[PDB]
Symmetry: T
Subunit: 148 residues, 12 copies
């Protein structure tokens, strides 16, 4: 049963990490599409705050402790690190693709762990997010591609 709460706790830390990272994209993008990227990443960091809270509260429902220490959040984060603080629009979209691919893989890991424990609530939460990101990733991939 610890594997479900272990994976929720991993996601809590990654959600925090992406919330910080998505602010970086939001502030520091430059170029003609500044405003739409700014608005896009604003919605995205809001989703990461919500995801942060949901993972924590699911852990609590499952009888464990959520992470409450900045230091632990920082140490446990495993989503892609970025060294930049200035971006083109296409660079942000490419970075987000990578961040969403990481989230997608981690949600499928959560689903499996939920499956082994017969945890339908956590499985439903995982799968709603899998659907959300497979849809976004299709759109992001099309945004990065050139036409034949």
């Amino acid at each position: 049963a610890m594997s479900v709460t272990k994976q929720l706790l991993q996601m809590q830390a990654d959600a925090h990490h992406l919330w910080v990272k998505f602010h970086n994209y939001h502030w520091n993008v430059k170029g003609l599409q500044f405003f739409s990227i700014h608005e896009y990443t604003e919605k995205a960091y809001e989703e990461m705050a919500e995801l942060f809270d949901s993972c924590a509260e699911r852990v609590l429902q499952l009888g464990e402790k959520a992470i409450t220490c900045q230091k632990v959040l920082m140490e446990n984060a495993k989503s892609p690190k970025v060294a930049k603080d200035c971006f083109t629009p296409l660079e942000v979209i490419e970075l987000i693709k990578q961040d969403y691919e990481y989230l997608l893989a981690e949600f499928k890991k959560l689903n499996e762990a939920a499956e082994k424990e017969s945890d339908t609530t956590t499985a439903a939460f995982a799968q709603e997010n899998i659907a959300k990101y497979e849809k976004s990733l299709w759109m992001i991939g099309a945004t990065l591609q050139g036409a034949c």
Copy 2:
């Protein structure tokens, strides 16, 4: 009197055709402006569904039969054919310009036929659409142009 219902029936088939075609643009556009083109063509195919229904129902009001067979719709369609299934944003906008120019010419044909029959209801329907497309085509032309 058959010329008004003949032209409404032509438009019914073209509206169906453009509804299918506009999905093609909606799905298969690639590049940075993916999302706005996707949203734009979504509104456009909704207008073509509405146009499909309006033409059919006007024919019925005029005492004739709307087309109800896929095969007849396909055979009767005369709006521009496209062979592609992958597009740049500028390519979609250029294709839509051509589709809207075709609609505009066909609505003016409908207006004339309505005029000869003193059909004020069909004439009003034609003219509301002429105004709509002359306005859109101005915007689309500006979108495709370079500045002096």
Copy 3:
């Protein structure tokens, strides 16, 4: 068969029902004309949405949606109707058969999705199974006479 093959079948069927549901909408006759006209309007709107959802899922899955109307026509397998004038009870009976067809296809889609471990497509199929099971209950009752 496969998730993408089944999605493409449903895309073609959604287009066919979108067209047929307009025939019911336009051509029903009788005292319940307006309620039937309104009902079929909402139904065709759902068929348009289904058409789009099926295509986009195929695209998300790395395959091409159908974009040619001739292919849509050739591939559709939902019930054919060679009438263009209906009573309200005839429309309801036809919609029942159309919804029985969709429900069976959604169940095939779910099976295919569970085999492929595709939770997203499975969730899509299951939401539709629930929608049609409920709607078919009400349609059945509409067509019955009491005990």
Copy 4:
């Protein structure tokens, strides 16, 4: 008649139909009572708007609207109804005849307006011509049996 004479005729008729549509609204009996009650309520509200619009167009054109109910009574020419009890089908048949009358009167108004180059009245006539042609289609389909 000239545009104003025709507007004044339509003012009288809108008043007459407003009264009559209340008769349908109150006095229909049978399973579809509530839908007819609701439809006829919308219809009389439309007749009240029509009455005001005709009158105010007359005032815009420099003439006096009808203000005496006795004149309104004497000038009305829309179909007379003797009954005070109806089936839903009878009401729909009577509304069709009322709407046919209005539609023909709006066409007379339009011709009159066109001759006087009165674009405002013409646009008002044509907007209503469109409204009644659409309704009359639906009403016709409602009274039909399927073939």
Copy 5:
């Protein structure tokens, strides 16, 4: 000896119709600086008369008698004040509406007394709701017409 609830409602039906027509006269034909506010006020007023007409008719039908369906009968039965004018200043309209509302109020009081003698709680509540409405409106209209000390 006064007429029953149903005959009072029938009278009220005929008057509401008459006032609906009459209020259009004020709506169309007022002249002067306050044209628009009088036009809007009288539009709300005729809409209330249309509603009253339908309410009285439907209450008569609920009580088992038939509503009036003929415009000749509506015209002959109306007893609300007539006006032989088709042009008005704003003060004239306000004065005339005061007379119309005083008339309505008096008739709603008769309606209430009839409803009470018949133990008709539904019609009594209907009458009293309206009595409250015109007592308030008449206070405001009276203040609009008065001169300050």
Copy 6:
């Protein structure tokens, strides 16, 4: 000699519960072309019964007696018409609802008379509001069932 307001409200509580259950039977089990409109009408109806149940209970509590909290007592005390059917045509449902509403109306009139003898203005207003509601509804239901001349 008739029972007090509080005992009448307690009866009304039990009936509202019974009709809430019964209206679900009509909601679920009507069959025929008008299935959906009957399904929706009866859904609005049971929601009104749920509200009535809570209102009567809370008024009894305001008057210092205790509401019924046991389903066995609710079942034993209900006096509204029973139906031994679980399948209905649309006309059957309309006919049966007419009988249920005529029952309610008669009980709300008793409630009003009891409230008046007790000078209970709150309960009287509550009863009369409901009397007005069912008199209107019963007029429409009766018209729905009649045949035109």
Copy 7:
């Protein structure tokens, strides 16, 4: 029990909780009266929705819902409450026990649904399992003392 037997059990129980939650709603006393009154009102509205949903799922599955209140009374198995007066804490403790009962019953419904490959009922069970697991967490925290 099979899916329908289990749905019918939950129909009876939803009815029972609807009644009981009114008892909490009316009869709580103490400083938090109004918030408990409001919370329990939302809770009984949820029980009324649950009652209708179970019944209609049964009808969809081809069986008859419970229509006799005597059957509803006899089949209910959720916790019995003898009292008719409560403190806010007592109400919260009693609701926790009611919600634990429901949560266990929804899990039985889900297992039953999964065995019958009934995705619609399964989704309905799991949606409620999620709802009660979340509520029960909050309720538990509400009854606790801090460490």
Copy 8:
């Protein structure tokens, strides 16, 4: 021999003003864990008192007497309970508001009796609407103060 409707309304005007001021005292000066919910409840309450003040004044004016316009007269005429406190626990506020509402309720009952003797349906309806409001509120406030069996 009891005072007329108009003098009762004038009393009610003065009290509503007093309670409007007093309810601010509870609003500002409550202390303790339930500070915010008491602050909000008493804000809704003073807003109701402001409305009552205006309603009573306007009804007096409709009845042809003049409303009170001087704050010295408002202060001298108020008879609702005074409180010589400017700090409160939540339970104290609830207890004090119970006393204020019991006072209002008793005065609205006198208002109703006066309105009935005068056949003043408008004021009677106004009084009874308010009687219904405080009977419900007082039930809830009483439950908030009680201890469970």
Copy 9:
């Protein structure tokens, strides 16, 4: 003259009235200050919209809109006012003359549009003709004294 020439004239006039209508809005004095201030606010907002619509129609028609304020000033031909303090009745009388001017220009635009078979510009002119005919009726009545 031509549709585009007439549109450009109206563009210049819309700008002029937009400015003048602010003068009425700011500088009216007297008891009806606020209603006049609100009325003229809505009116200048319509002038801004008219300015934009006229320019964009010229652009749709392949010609250049006016973009220089000196050209706008030189070309405006609506009534000049050399006052900056007004009574409410003076504002209404001036607005009447401004609206009579606009109505005549809209009629010229319609004629030009019908000659050019330009249904879009004609519809634009006719919607405005109807708006101003109605508004001038009400303004006239505002300025009259009763019989």
Copy 10:
């Protein structure tokens, strides 16, 4: 006065104006009755908000608000009104004098706040200074005759 002494003065005055504005609201007579009735209603609602805001700012600053109506009566210094019947123009003239009084008191509050480096009270003063300067302009224009 210090900031709190000045806030307490404004608390008393807001109470006084709340009462007075009801007098204007009830007792105005003449053609503009309804607009004055509506304007003064908004005005007293503003005075009630002002009364609460001053009191709560005092509480924030560590002092006690006024709770006794006798103190409120004795401390009020806004213009005394003896009348209980008014023309619309008289009401507007009296409101101008009330608003001038408030505006001067808000300026005193601002100076006091600035001296104490109290940004919160200062911002509150200045927001109201802006409000009354704008209103007083409109009120002035309303009382004027045009030149």
Copy 11:
């Protein structure tokens, strides 16, 4: 005291000027971002109409006369003049940057004049606008920049 009303009157004339100029951008931009620039400049000219009215009405509150003559508005305008009537999207954004920089400098001039007169109402109006334009100018500058 004349320096506050002098500066409000300068701003009234510039607001009028920018309202005309912003229509020029709105109509005459060409290129892929036509529609968003069109929408952006539409909001901007609405703000300039509002600014025009606010400056005028503040002058009137201060006991002076607003400008009511087109000719005076034209003569007094000092915001940047543009000679073009056709623009790329980036050209419009660059021109707006310059127009907003001018507004920002003029609002700070207004604030100072308000300060010297203790005019808190005009100072508040100035400062609300300073905040608005410093925020917009940050966004506009990022839109024009390239990433490091």
Copy 12:
């Protein structure tokens, strides 16, 4: 110190409080669990907004916002809490200390802003000073016992 240095300090503090306010939100125990949970949700949402506003002001001022969580952690100076279980009164007492800290920092920001003649940052600081002065009043009263 400087405006940008103070803004960066507050950015780090906003992040720290955002995290801590979630601890209160999750881990409070007792009868007021839900109101405290809702209160702290709104509070953390304000901390997220504050984080963003502080960063964007620094960027507007030509400097870089903090984008590394290690820097955020190192720089935060708001009160540390080494508990993860709370009563409702403990949460309120901690929030009081957190809000006292923010208020003092906002006052330093205002001073720095006025020195730099930065009206925009000063307005930001002052709106927050007013918000926290009011909220601390209410929190204080929540923690008191009456006289």
